[PDB]
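Hi team,

Below is the intake form for Protein-tyrosine kinase 2-beta from Homo sapiens. Please confirm the fields before the structure is written into the shared record.

FORM ID: S-0412
PROTEIN: Protein-tyrosine kinase 2-beta
ORGANISM: Homo sapiens
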Amino acid sequence: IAREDVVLNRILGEGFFGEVYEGVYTNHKGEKINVAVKTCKKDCTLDNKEKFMSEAVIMKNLDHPHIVKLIGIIEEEPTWIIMELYPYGELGHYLERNKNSLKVLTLVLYSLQICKAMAYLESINCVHRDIAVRNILVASPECVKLGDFGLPIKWMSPESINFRRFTTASDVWMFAVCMWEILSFGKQPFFWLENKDVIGVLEKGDRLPKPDLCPPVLYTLMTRCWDYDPSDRPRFTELVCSLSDVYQMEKDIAM
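The structure came back. Fields below:
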């Protein structure tokens, strides 16, 4: 990718490392792909600049149908990381707009897709730390994509909050919170608390309540993921199998 092949159109948002621009990339066969162009502030530390690149290289290599796609990298300053722009935007906002139309079938589908992404991450012992509907993009009405790697106290396992310990097991906790968000049509977890109060409530043994439209079987699954003991939590491979079963059941009920 040469820089000329990309045209910047407007500001998209601010990212951790620097501004993100909305653009269009014209590929070799002449097609036009909508892109998000991530940049790195000129004031950044060498450690920051390296991290930006090293995260980019991970996104480049994942190539998974439920993780956001990287189009290309322009290393030459100003460094651009060119990501696919998805039309429907963030899953959280998407759920909010379409709460009247979306049925449980589709909500379980999105959960399943994210679970599969995480099973792949699990397989390379890569810890994500940002499984939330704000960081999931809607590519199509029946296809969601986990965004980039990761504080989100209301989403975090006890061991993450207390100690900043992050493992695949803490990701499982967080994935369940994410499923709770999906079945709740984009509600913030523990929206009734201050961040300070969360670990307190968690320590007591209190959990997020079952969303109205969440099937009991799925809530039971969430409850296992929120076991205080990270060793007792299901693995993502097991969860894919469970969610596959629930999905198929909900599909047949729907038809």
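SUMMARY LINE: The CA atoms of residues 89 and 137 lie 5 Å apart.

Thanks, M.
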